[PDB]
Amino acid sequence: NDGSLHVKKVGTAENEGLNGAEFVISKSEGSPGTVKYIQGVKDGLYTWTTDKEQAKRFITGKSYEIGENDFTEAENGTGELTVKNLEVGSYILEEVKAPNNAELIENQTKTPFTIEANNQTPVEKTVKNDTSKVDKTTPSLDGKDVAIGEKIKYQISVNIPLGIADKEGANKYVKFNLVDKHDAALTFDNVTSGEYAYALYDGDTVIAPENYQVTEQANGFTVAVNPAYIPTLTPGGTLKFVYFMHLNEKADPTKGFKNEANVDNGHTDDQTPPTVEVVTGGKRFIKVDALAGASFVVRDQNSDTANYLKIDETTKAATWVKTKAEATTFTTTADGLVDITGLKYGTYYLEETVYVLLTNRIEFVVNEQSYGTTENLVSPEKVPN
């Protein structure tokens, strides 16, 4: 009459409360024991059936007590289930249906509970359901700006299901995959040795390459754990893929370059998939009195020992070199323009190498506002002669 059960249903991804999990409540009476389920209410008491198809479905986010020959239901806190007016005795709270975009965990599906005599304190139980949170980061970058060609460290992370080794007859999880799709202007460095080799981890342990397969789609890839190795993954741990991409020749400073990741396990995924965006920088100048024949280089410091900007003709990758000979020269045509693209943000110096030859460098900033978008390019900075 006065005993009660209070359940918190949570997801494994963020310990978040989950509504719409469905439970039945059983007891065992007899020798040998016959199982019975709460079916309904009659004369201040719960009625019982041995037919599980007729068992009352208690749903998380609702509370239930005995009414006049029917259940009195009300809305409960998120992921909470309250069942009042239980008689003294031992019971099993049995999960029969997972919430949307959640999966059952085998050792969470049957929760024993005891209602004690003369005890109105709610009995507290927690029940976990597997959910997915995917994370994507660039753990080495100072900000968001990069040079074209610069190898960028990426990390994709997902919580590993608590039920990763559960079995249905026939494992519960027959695939477990991380997927990335990204801008055409990003190229995944599919490299299996050296500084930029990718790596798949269970916690801090490296998974041997034969236990997964990397495949590339159009502007994306999939990391697929081998079906036979999935039950070895750490339940509740983290699966982490660490890799490198770079901006290719298609990149320019007018767009952001995004990637997005998610998990594919047959069961659950992230409804708000993680994205990362990176940008590159640029600056435009126009030589005027528009003058052609003007040649320049870019220095990374206002000094003679500074480096020189180098732009690879094929990849458009931007690097710094120690001599003028190794530098890229920008020579103005009739339009008078100098179009410097693919730099990291920062302060740089334009140096005229070939009217009066300039006697000082022109300091310029590269940043979010220095170049523009394709529709509205920022006016080139005039260089008078």
Ligand SMILES: [Mg+2]
């Ligand atoms: Mg999300």
Ligand code: NA
């Ligand atoms: Na899951």
Ligand code: NA
């Ligand atoms: Na820009």
